Design a protein around this ligand. Structure first.
Ligand SMILES: CC[C@@H]1C(=O)N(C)c2cnc(Nc3ccc(C(=O)N[C@H]4CC[C@H](N5CCN(CC6CC6)CC5)CC4)cc3OC)nc2N1C(C)C
Ligand SMILES: CC[C@@H]1C(=O)N(C)c2cnc(Nc3ccc(C(=O)N[C@H]4CC[C@H](N5CCN(CC6CC6)CC5)CC4)cc3OC)nc2N1C(C)C
Ligand SMILES: [Zn+2]
Ligand SMILES: [Zn+2]
Lengths: 293, 293
């Protein structure tokens, strides 16, 4: 094997990070809490060994992820605080999100209450508005990529499938990777762009409100077939205003969906209660939003 | 971890296999030479731990592979000699192919001579004729799945993506897995059948004669795009009769390709030299097929 160092030094910034506890691993990366030995402030470190970056294509994907993410700064995007490397590893320094992601929330709570769905969906949309106006398509928005800080604020992360739109009307023809909430224009390989992320948000909203994803089966290719056929249903207990907005977003024709900028003007948002914040108990117990002191 | 036993007992057949040397691993399986303690004859054992078969879908794929393969017996198909299980593992007993596969040959020889290509391609086609007349589509014919015994005879193996055609004109809509030489009707998800294997044979013939696969790029999705666009070329040094047959097989429209039964009647075969066998040196040195004693 090749061992990961206990202290990480960036020679340009002159900065040292002590490697703390293990956060998880996925794709090519192992992740740890890392504290700046000097400033003592804590980060999420993503460490990827160069032994798995032997092919130029895999290196280029890494370089792109970093290039896209380093140029982003927004309240609902994961803060990018630096990156550096030695002969064995690439280290990326990211904003630590102490409440993990909406994945862990969903596992614990299943369907959320409408106001909670509204609260998270608004921050997800705001994050994505920022992306899209800077010509970035995320292309893998999912529960696992929507991180939550201490105050239950959403931070969009994992730009491993993101791409920049370089000219007006550019249709991306290729997507290297397998998103979760994957849009029909991708699956048929007919060309794709910004609308891909609105599709994913539609899936996310369905999941948050219903407690299961709209095209789930026990087989991935069977699911892609459902998505091709637009074969989902919205349970009757879902409110019509929410159901309508889901249906607008989850449409086969990309050009028929709303754009990211329209969404917060939908009646789902403008005529429903949007809490200003959620108490920490919302990780565990459904909130009833009492008017009581 | 969970340790694999040194001796494998099948309680129905009453048979014991001593576990010999490690052959390799891929997907979910570790593979070893295994000798029948009684008869002393040697097999290839594919051992897959049940800890990776926790989902019904993954178990069903295994059951299907076995069901398809156990019902097959042909000179150019890998012999199926049994299967059994304990609480921790499934064990499959297969014909040992001491010369590994055409993958290892290709790595060592690159482009083969025309007569060699003819020799292997004929056995590949014969194996596939057998499959197709028993309504089996292999769906992942590639160099790595075309094993060679001591006498350099081809044995088609890995039925992990195979499917049975249950009625006339059935179009398979789904393929769980990622073939190497993947046909355009699969990639676009428009429905597919027997023609898928002829496409793969076209790719195999290209590879055997040219020394590289027809749609290779440094990115898998980029390759799928080439295949969508039928974007390959045949080098000028390839003989026109071979080039013509490749082009007939490597066509976007499935219904425009030859069927497996037509192939051996192609001029590529009927008007070229087909050696009756190849000497062992053909693993390493190009043969010149001298008429000299
Ligand atoms: C860095 C990349 C990405 C990203 O881009 N950003 C921006 C990001 C930001 N912030 C975080 N935070 C946390 C992530 C995770 C945790 C955790 O508790 N992890 C635990 C998960 C279960 C593990 N257990 C399972 C049961 N095992 C026992 C066996 C019997 C069952 C023993 C081992 C132990 C570790 C805490 C966090 O915060 C304190 N993660 C991020 N990630 C990734 C980690 C997905
Ligand atoms: C069973 C499933 C499938 C199947 O369905 N059928 C029907 C089948 C039939 N027959 C075989 N035969 C053989 C397969 C393989 C070998 C070999 O030499 N393997 C070696 C490969 C390199 C490994 N090395 C690499 C360098 N490492 C050192 C480091 C520094 C580089 C050390 C470890 C050591 C083992 C020999 C065979 O025959 C004697 N395999 C089959 N397979 C699979 C194995 C693909
Ligand atoms: Zn599947
Ligand atoms: Zn790629």
């Amino acid at each position: 094997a090749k061992e990961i160092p206990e202290v990480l030094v960036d020679p340009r910034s002159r900065r040292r990070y002590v490697r703390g506890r293990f956060l998880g691993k996925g794709g090519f990366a192992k992740c740890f809490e890392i504290s700046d030995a000097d400033t003592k402030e804590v980060f999420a470190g993503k460490i990827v060994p160069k032994s798995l970056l032997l092919k130029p294509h895999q290196r280029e994907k890494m370089s792109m992820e970093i290039s896209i993410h380093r140029s982003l700064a927004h309240q609902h995007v994961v803060g990018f605080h630096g990156f550096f490397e030695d002969n064995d590893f690439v280290f990326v320094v990211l904003e630590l999100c102490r409440r993990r992601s909406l994945l862990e929330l969903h596992k614990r709570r299943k369907a959320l209450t409408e106001p909670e769905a509204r609260y998270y969906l608004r921050q997800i949309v705001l994050g994505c508005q920022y992306l899209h106006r800077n010509r970035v398509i995320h292309r893998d928005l999912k529960l696992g990529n929507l991180f939550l800080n201490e105050d239950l604020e959403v931070k969009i992360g994992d730009f491993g499938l993101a791409t920049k739109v370089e000219y007006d009307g550019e249709r991306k023809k290729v997507l290297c990777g397998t998103p979760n909430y994957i849009a029909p224009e991708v699956l048929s390989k007919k060309g794709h762009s910004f609308e891909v992320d609105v599709w994913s948000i539609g899936c996310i909203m369905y999941t948050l409100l219903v407690g299961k994803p709209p095209f789930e089966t026990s087989c991935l290719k069977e699911t892609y077939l459902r998505i091709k056929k637009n074969e989902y249903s919205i349970p009757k207990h879902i409110n019509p205003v929410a159901a309508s907005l889901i249906q607008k977003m989850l449409q086969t024709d990309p050009t028929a969906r709303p754009t990211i900028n329209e969404l917060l003007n939908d009646e789902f948002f403008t005529s429903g209660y949007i809490p200003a914040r959620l108490p920490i108990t919302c990780l565990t117990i459904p909130p009833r939003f009492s008017i009581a002191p």
